[PDB]
Amino acid sequence: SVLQVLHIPDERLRKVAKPVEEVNAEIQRIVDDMFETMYAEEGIGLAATQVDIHQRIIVIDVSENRDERLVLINPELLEKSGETGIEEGCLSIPEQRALVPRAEKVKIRALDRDGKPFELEADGLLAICIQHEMDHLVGKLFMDYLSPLKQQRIRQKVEKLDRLK
Ligand code: NI
């Protein structure tokens, strides 16, 4: 099923997700629902916190043909290097983009949808998306890196959009 994506101001977006206990059928259904939601919202990443599920689960797909499913369950940053940034969007912050500092490369470990551990070295867009999604699981948003005024501006714009929807 396609799930409801929370938007700021929503305080739930500020929650810190708990680690996943076992990767069972129930976890796998959450993963599958999260992909469905992500794809439907035309997104490249989604964290469980965004759909009010506070467990360390991320889904990502940075491909055009939407057939490269990356699942990060209980992800762990093992190393990062360099610096970069692009103008990032966020399904929890509709229609607002801003450039945000990020590591250029990350190396992470996580469990996949079967519960298998794997390591992944990423760079470019995928590194940035991974960092953005991992920020979600500790209640952090791309807005947090901007000036207090810019946070208020953005948060004002979002509240106006949800009034009209
Ligand atoms: Ni986001």
Side-chain angles (χ1 to χ4, degrees):
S1 316
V2 183
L3 305 173
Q4 275 163 28
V5 179
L6 305 159
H7 309 153
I8 65 153
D10 202 316
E11 178 63 46
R12 300 191 204 90
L13 283 170
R14 293 315 191 160
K15 284 202 205 174
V16 168
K18 287 197 304 163
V20 165
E21 278 294 77
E22 301 302 355
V23 186
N24 47 28
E26 159 59 7
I27 298 299
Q28 285 169 335
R29 190 62 208 257
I30 293 169
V31 160
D32 293 351
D33 285 12
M34 278 169 69
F35 271 115
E36 202 171 324
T37 301
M38 188 196 76
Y39 287 133
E41 311 274 344
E42 304 154 37
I44 49 150
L46 182 74
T49 319
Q50 281 169 286
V51 293
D52 201 30
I53 308 171
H54 308 274
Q55 287 192 43
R56 293 185 61 78
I57 310 163
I58 290 158
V59 293
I60 278 160
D61 187 344
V62 295
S63 73
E64 178 170 11
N65 284 3
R66 292 151 142 217
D67 61 4
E68 278 177 64
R69 299 184 167 218
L70 175 67
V71 169
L72 311 166
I73 296 176
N74 299 341
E76 298 174 3
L77 177 64
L78 300 158
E79 75 192 322
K80 60 185 188 191
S81 66
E83 325 78 44
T84 196
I86 61 183
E87 291 187 21
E88 291 185 24
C90 183
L91 305 158
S92 281
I93 315 175
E95 294 168 27
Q96 313 315 303
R97 291 165 174 97
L99 168 80
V100 140
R102 299 289 186 188
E104 174 185 64
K105 308 175 187 276
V106 298
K107 169 185 155 168
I108 69 140
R109 185 183 305 119
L111 304 183
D112 66 19
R113 182 184 173 282
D114 301 315
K116 199 204 202 164
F118 66 104
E119 303 170 60
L120 167 69
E121 293 166 1
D123 62 28
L125 183 66
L126 178 58
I128 287 155
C129 188
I130 293 172
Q131 288 167 80
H132 173 108
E133 298 309 328
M134 276 179 83
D135 270 355
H136 274 307
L137 297 175
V138 288
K140 178 152 59 183
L141 300 160
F142 79 84
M143 270 190 310
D144 296 351
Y145 299 91
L146 307 174
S147 82
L149 179 55
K150 279 186 164 69
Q151 310 186 31
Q152 190 181 35
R153 273 217 191 88
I154 288 168
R155 201 216 314 161
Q156 261 160 6
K157 281 186 193 154
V158 171
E159 277 151 26
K160 194 169 68 274
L161 275 182
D162 287 333
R163 254 188 300 173
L164 194 36
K165 279 315 124 216

mmCIF file with all atom_site columns, all heavy atoms in Angstrom, residues 45 50 89-92 132-133 136 141-142, ligand 1:
data_model
loop_
_atom_site.group_PDB
_atom_site.id
_atom_site.type_symbol
_atom_site.label_atom_id
_atom_site.label_alt_id
_atom_site.label_comp_id
_atom_site.label_asym_id
_atom_site.label_entity_id
_atom_site.label_seq_id
_atom_site.pdbx_PDB_ins_code
_atom_site.Cartn_x
_atom_site.Cartn_y
_atom_site.Cartn_z
_atom_site.occupancy
_atom_site.B_iso_or_equiv
_atom_site.pdbx_formal_charge
_atom_site.auth_seq_id
_atom_site.auth_comp_id
_atom_site.auth_asym_id
_atom_site.auth_atom_id
_atom_site.pdbx_PDB_model_num
ATOM   1  N  N   . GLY A 1 45  ? 14.296 8.571  -2.433 1.00 0.00 ? 45  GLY A N   1
ATOM   2  C  CA  . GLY A 1 45  ? 14.621 8.062  -1.108 1.00 0.00 ? 45  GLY A CA  1
ATOM   3  C  C   . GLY A 1 45  ? 13.446 8.256  -0.180 1.00 0.00 ? 45  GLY A C   1
ATOM   4  O  O   . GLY A 1 45  ? 12.651 9.182  -0.366 1.00 0.00 ? 45  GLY A O   1
ATOM   5  N  N   . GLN A 1 50  ? 9.502  9.100  8.026  1.00 0.00 ? 50  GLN A N   1
ATOM   6  C  CA  . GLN A 1 50  ? 8.656  9.952  7.202  1.00 0.00 ? 50  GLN A CA  1
ATOM   7  C  C   . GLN A 1 50  ? 7.241  9.415  7.066  1.00 0.00 ? 50  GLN A C   1
ATOM   8  O  O   . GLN A 1 50  ? 6.303  10.194 6.891  1.00 0.00 ? 50  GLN A O   1
ATOM   9  C  CB  . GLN A 1 50  ? 9.271  10.161 5.827  1.00 0.00 ? 50  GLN A CB  1
ATOM   10 C  CG  . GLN A 1 50  ? 10.392 11.186 5.786  1.00 0.00 ? 50  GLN A CG  1
ATOM   11 C  CD  . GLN A 1 50  ? 11.124 11.153 4.469  1.00 0.00 ? 50  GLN A CD  1
ATOM   12 O  OE1 . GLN A 1 50  ? 11.902 10.232 4.194  1.00 0.00 ? 50  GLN A OE1 1
ATOM   13 N  NE2 . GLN A 1 50  ? 10.850 12.134 3.623  1.00 0.00 ? 50  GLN A NE2 1
ATOM   14 N  N   . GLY A 1 89  ? 15.935 18.079 -2.368 1.00 0.00 ? 89  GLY A N   1
ATOM   15 C  CA  . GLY A 1 89  ? 14.491 18.148 -2.126 1.00 0.00 ? 89  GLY A CA  1
ATOM   16 C  C   . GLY A 1 89  ? 14.166 17.171 -1.016 1.00 0.00 ? 89  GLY A C   1
ATOM   17 O  O   . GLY A 1 89  ? 15.044 16.484 -0.520 1.00 0.00 ? 89  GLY A O   1
ATOM   18 N  N   . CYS A 1 90  ? 12.909 17.120 -0.601 1.00 0.00 ? 90  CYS A N   1
ATOM   19 C  CA  . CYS A 1 90  ? 12.498 16.196 0.444  1.00 0.00 ? 90  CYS A CA  1
ATOM   20 C  C   . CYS A 1 90  ? 11.001 16.052 0.378  1.00 0.00 ? 90  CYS A C   1
ATOM   21 O  O   . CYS A 1 90  ? 10.269 17.058 0.347  1.00 0.00 ? 90  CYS A O   1
ATOM   22 C  CB  . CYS A 1 90  ? 12.925 16.672 1.840  1.00 0.00 ? 90  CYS A CB  1
ATOM   23 S  SG  . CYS A 1 90  ? 12.497 15.498 3.181  1.00 0.00 ? 90  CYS A SG  1
ATOM   24 N  N   . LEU A 1 91  ? 10.536 14.805 0.329  1.00 0.00 ? 91  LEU A N   1
ATOM   25 C  CA  . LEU A 1 91  ? 9.087  14.556 0.246  1.00 0.00 ? 91  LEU A CA  1
ATOM   26 C  C   . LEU A 1 91  ? 8.380  15.072 1.503  1.00 0.00 ? 91  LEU A C   1
ATOM   27 O  O   . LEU A 1 91  ? 7.186  15.290 1.477  1.00 0.00 ? 91  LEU A O   1
ATOM   28 C  CB  . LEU A 1 91  ? 8.787  13.067 -0.036 1.00 0.00 ? 91  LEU A CB  1
ATOM   29 C  CG  . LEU A 1 91  ? 9.498  12.547 -1.305 1.00 0.00 ? 91  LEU A CG  1
ATOM   30 C  CD1 . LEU A 1 91  ? 9.687  11.013 -1.361 1.00 0.00 ? 91  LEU A CD1 1
ATOM   31 C  CD2 . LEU A 1 91  ? 8.777  13.072 -2.559 1.00 0.00 ? 91  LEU A CD2 1
ATOM   32 N  N   . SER A 1 92  ? 9.124  15.320 2.586  1.00 0.00 ? 92  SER A N   1
ATOM   33 C  CA  . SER A 1 92  ? 8.518  15.899 3.803  1.00 0.00 ? 92  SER A CA  1
ATOM   34 C  C   . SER A 1 92  ? 8.518  17.428 3.789  1.00 0.00 ? 92  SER A C   1
ATOM   35 O  O   . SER A 1 92  ? 7.957  18.072 4.677  1.00 0.00 ? 92  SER A O   1
ATOM   36 C  CB  . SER A 1 92  ? 9.209  15.371 5.064  1.00 0.00 ? 92  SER A CB  1
ATOM   37 O  OG  . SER A 1 92  ? 8.742  14.070 5.380  1.00 0.00 ? 92  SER A OG  1
ATOM   38 N  N   . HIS A 1 132 ? 21.140 12.010 3.449  1.00 0.00 ? 132 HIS A N   1
ATOM   39 C  CA  . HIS A 1 132 ? 19.835 12.701 3.631  1.00 0.00 ? 132 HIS A CA  1
ATOM   40 C  C   . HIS A 1 132 ? 18.859 11.738 4.310  1.00 0.00 ? 132 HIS A C   1
ATOM   41 O  O   . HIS A 1 132 ? 18.188 12.130 5.283  1.00 0.00 ? 132 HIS A O   1
ATOM   42 C  CB  . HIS A 1 132 ? 19.309 13.104 2.255  1.00 0.00 ? 132 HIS A CB  1
ATOM   43 C  CG  . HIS A 1 132 ? 17.908 13.666 2.245  1.00 0.00 ? 132 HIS A CG  1
ATOM   44 N  ND1 . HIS A 1 132 ? 17.665 15.003 2.022  1.00 0.00 ? 132 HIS A ND1 1
ATOM   45 C  CD2 . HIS A 1 132 ? 16.689 13.076 2.357  1.00 0.00 ? 132 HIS A CD2 1
ATOM   46 C  CE1 . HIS A 1 132 ? 16.355 15.222 2.020  1.00 0.00 ? 132 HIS A CE1 1
ATOM   47 N  NE2 . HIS A 1 132 ? 15.738 14.065 2.225  1.00 0.00 ? 132 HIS A NE2 1
ATOM   48 N  N   . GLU A 1 133 ? 18.786 10.496 3.808  1.00 0.00 ? 133 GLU A N   1
ATOM   49 C  CA  . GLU A 1 133 ? 17.881 9.480  4.394  1.00 0.00 ? 133 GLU A CA  1
ATOM   50 C  C   . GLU A 1 133 ? 18.284 9.033  5.798  1.00 0.00 ? 133 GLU A C   1
ATOM   51 O  O   . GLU A 1 133 ? 17.425 8.905  6.670  1.00 0.00 ? 133 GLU A O   1
ATOM   52 C  CB  . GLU A 1 133 ? 17.650 8.283  3.457  1.00 0.00 ? 133 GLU A CB  1
ATOM   53 C  CG  . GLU A 1 133 ? 16.968 8.615  2.101  1.00 0.00 ? 133 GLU A CG  1
ATOM   54 C  CD  . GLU A 1 133 ? 15.697 9.424  2.265  1.00 0.00 ? 133 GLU A CD  1
ATOM   55 O  OE1 . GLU A 1 133 ? 15.015 9.244  3.293  1.00 0.00 ? 133 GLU A OE1 1
ATOM   56 O  OE2 . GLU A 1 133 ? 15.365 10.243 1.379  1.00 0.00 ? 133 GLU A OE2 1
ATOM   57 N  N   . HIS A 1 136 ? 17.154 11.503 8.336  1.00 0.00 ? 136 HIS A N   1
ATOM   58 C  CA  . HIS A 1 136 ? 15.746 11.296 8.685  1.00 0.00 ? 136 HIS A CA  1
ATOM   59 C  C   . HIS A 1 136 ? 15.535 10.393 9.883  1.00 0.00 ? 136 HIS A C   1
ATOM   60 O  O   . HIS A 1 136 ? 14.627 10.627 10.656 1.00 0.00 ? 136 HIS A O   1
ATOM   61 C  CB  . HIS A 1 136 ? 14.960 10.713 7.513  1.00 0.00 ? 136 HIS A CB  1
ATOM   62 C  CG  . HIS A 1 136 ? 14.445 11.739 6.560  1.00 0.00 ? 136 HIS A CG  1
ATOM   63 N  ND1 . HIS A 1 136 ? 13.694 12.823 6.967  1.00 0.00 ? 136 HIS A ND1 1
ATOM   64 C  CD2 . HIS A 1 136 ? 14.561 11.839 5.212  1.00 0.00 ? 136 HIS A CD2 1
ATOM   65 C  CE1 . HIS A 1 136 ? 13.370 13.547 5.910  1.00 0.00 ? 136 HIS A CE1 1
ATOM   66 N  NE2 . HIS A 1 136 ? 13.881 12.971 4.833  1.00 0.00 ? 136 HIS A NE2 1
ATOM   67 N  N   . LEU A 1 141 ? 16.559 17.081 9.317  1.00 0.00 ? 141 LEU A N   1
ATOM   68 C  CA  . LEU A 1 141 ? 16.037 17.476 7.997  1.00 0.00 ? 141 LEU A CA  1
ATOM   69 C  C   . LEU A 1 141 ? 17.030 18.390 7.277  1.00 0.00 ? 141 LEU A C   1
ATOM   70 O  O   . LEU A 1 141 ? 17.850 19.049 7.936  1.00 0.00 ? 141 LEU A O   1
ATOM   71 C  CB  . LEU A 1 141 ? 14.694 18.188 8.159  1.00 0.00 ? 141 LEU A CB  1
ATOM   72 C  CG  . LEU A 1 141 ? 13.584 17.374 8.828  1.00 0.00 ? 141 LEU A CG  1
ATOM   73 C  CD1 . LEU A 1 141 ? 12.493 18.275 9.375  1.00 0.00 ? 141 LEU A CD1 1
ATOM   74 C  CD2 . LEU A 1 141 ? 12.995 16.374 7.858  1.00 0.00 ? 141 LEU A CD2 1
ATOM   75 N  N   . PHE A 1 142 ? 16.975 18.437 5.940  1.00 0.00 ? 142 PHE A N   1
ATOM   76 C  CA  . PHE A 1 142 ? 18.015 19.176 5.189  1.00 0.00 ? 142 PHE A CA  1
ATOM   77 C  C   . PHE A 1 142 ? 17.983 20.678 5.584  1.00 0.00 ? 142 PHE A C   1
ATOM   78 O  O   . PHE A 1 142 ? 19.045 21.344 5.607  1.00 0.00 ? 142 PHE A O   1
ATOM   79 C  CB  . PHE A 1 142 ? 17.947 18.921 3.667  1.00 0.00 ? 142 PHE A CB  1
ATOM   80 C  CG  . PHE A 1 142 ? 16.851 19.725 2.937  1.00 0.00 ? 142 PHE A CG  1
ATOM   81 C  CD1 . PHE A 1 142 ? 17.087 21.033 2.535  1.00 0.00 ? 142 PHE A CD1 1
ATOM   82 C  CD2 . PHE A 1 142 ? 15.630 19.141 2.618  1.00 0.00 ? 142 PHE A CD2 1
ATOM   83 C  CE1 . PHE A 1 142 ? 16.104 21.784 1.872  1.00 0.00 ? 142 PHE A CE1 1
ATOM   84 C  CE2 . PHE A 1 142 ? 14.647 19.856 1.942  1.00 0.00 ? 142 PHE A CE2 1
ATOM   85 C  CZ  . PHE A 1 142 ? 14.883 21.179 1.565  1.00 0.00 ? 142 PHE A CZ  1
HETATM 86 NI NI  . NI  B 2 .   ? 13.844 13.795 2.970  1.00 0.00 ? 1   NI  B NI  1
#
